[PDB]
Amino acid sequence: QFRNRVINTKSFGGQCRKVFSGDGKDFYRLSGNVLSYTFQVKINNDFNYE
Amino acid sequence: NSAFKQAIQASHKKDSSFIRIHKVMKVLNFTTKAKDLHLSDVFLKALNHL
């Protein structure tokens, strides 16, 4: 299970680090220290009829 | 006197299909400049801290 908040994910460090989500068609502000955050999509589907 | 009649009909049908696709659609290409590349601040900070 995921437990409680350990890391501050929103310390912007005074940077204006915009990313355009592309997906979601909006701009989001990343924290100054996150190594990456990206929005390419994957989908997986499996059917088993029997 | 004996009389006898028999009629046995049988069938076995077996039907199958398989279908597979792998289609790839490129929609943009890029080439990075060779020089004066502007590094990201998180990478620059990691290099500086080395």
Side-chain angles (χ1 to χ4, degrees):
Chain A
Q1 63 204 344
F2 300 88
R3 300 304 297 120
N4 294 298
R5 183 182 168 251
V6 170
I7 286 148
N8 177 6
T9 53
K10 296 182 296 190
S11 51
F12 307 110
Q15 300 182 16
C16 184
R17 197 179 171 192
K18 289 160 65 181
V19 62
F20 182 64
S21 185
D23 176 40
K25 299 183 11 177
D26 199 2
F27 289 86
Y28 303 123
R29 191 172 178 195
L30 302 92
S31 71
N33 60 328
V34 73
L35 281 171
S36 192
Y37 196 102
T38 60
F39 306 89
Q40 63 179 344
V41 162
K42 308 194 186 181
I43 317 289
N44 288 50
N45 178 58
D46 295 0
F47 265 43
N48 294 16
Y49 286 31
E50 315 186 348
Chain B
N1 180 280
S2 300
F4 168 113
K5 191 175 304 303
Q6 170 179 267
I8 315 299
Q9 191 287 346
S11 178
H12 172 290
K13 192 175 184 180
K14 172 178 296 179
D15 274 351
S16 308
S17 177
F18 148 61
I19 299 180
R20 185 176 68 69
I21 310 182
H22 181 80
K23 186 171 181 176
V24 180
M25 301 299 298
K26 293 172 175 181
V27 314
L28 70 82
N29 69 74
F30 70 99
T31 295
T32 307
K33 274 192 172 188
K35 295 191 178 183
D36 84 282
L37 294 180
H38 190 288
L39 306 189
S40 72
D41 299 334
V42 72
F43 179 40
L44 189 69
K45 190 173 187 71
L47 293 178
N48 285 341
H49 198 266
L50 284 167

